[PDB]
Symmetry: C2
Subunit: 132 residues, 2 copies
């Protein structure tokens, strides 16, 4: 696939794929959300946003974050609230990493939206995480 979106839990200094919303995670785990981009025809300069939200009765705007970046000339441009993001190039693949930590009980989602060529939608995905 040209785009991929994954959540990893840091366990004993290894990244372990989080592959089911059914699995409750304990608090105090580091998470990494990874957007992998394989460039090609029509895929170069991009606008990307990550949307972190929590859900349920105790939904709070306080826990909401948007991380907005652009990729221009294969370089990362921090647009808004994107200081913790990082871009890494590995063998024709660009990986954008968003770090988080499990802290509040309940359902949390991270959504990613990728647009290019004057706002054409290239990719959207979302990962839910349950925390004890």
């Amino acid at each position: 696939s040209q785009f991929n979106f994954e959540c990893f839990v840091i366990e004993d200094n290894k990244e372990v794929l989080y592959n089911s919303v059914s699995r409750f995670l304990p608090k105090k785990r580091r998470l990494t959300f990874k957007l992998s981009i394989y460039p090609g025809p029509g895929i170069g300069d991009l606008k990307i946003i990550f949307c972190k939200r929590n859900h349920g009765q105790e939904a709070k705007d306080d826990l909401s974050e948007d991380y907005s970046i652009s990729i221009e000339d294969n370089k990362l441009i921090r647009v808004k609230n994107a200081d913790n993001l990082s871009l890494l190039r590995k063998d024709g693949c660009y990986v954008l990493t968003v770090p988080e930590e499990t802290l509040f009980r309940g359902l949390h989602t991270m959504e990613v939206i990728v647009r290019g060529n004057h706002e054409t939608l290239f990719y959207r995905n979302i990962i839910g995480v349950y925390i004890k």
Copy 2:
């Protein structure tokens, strides 16, 4: 204030600690150099530079890089050639990560220099890597 400086090689999707000049690595391996900062009280703003150099009969200026960052008011400031650097905040320590790839045969070093108030030297360390 306490500092640590470590090098990790990615081997089967895990960060494996690479001790300085402890073995020869093949080409096309990913490396991460991590400076960990355990800030003490009144440490003030910091100026940090990483210096990459290669050594031997084929010492080459085109392989040298300097990555310069500051920590000002507890935020990362990318000063020069620091787009690939990232800063992760953990419980009681900051971690600055410098990614590299093994590409040229011989000895290479990554040196880190940390200065603070009045250009006072707080820390210096260096790690060497052998590449096949």
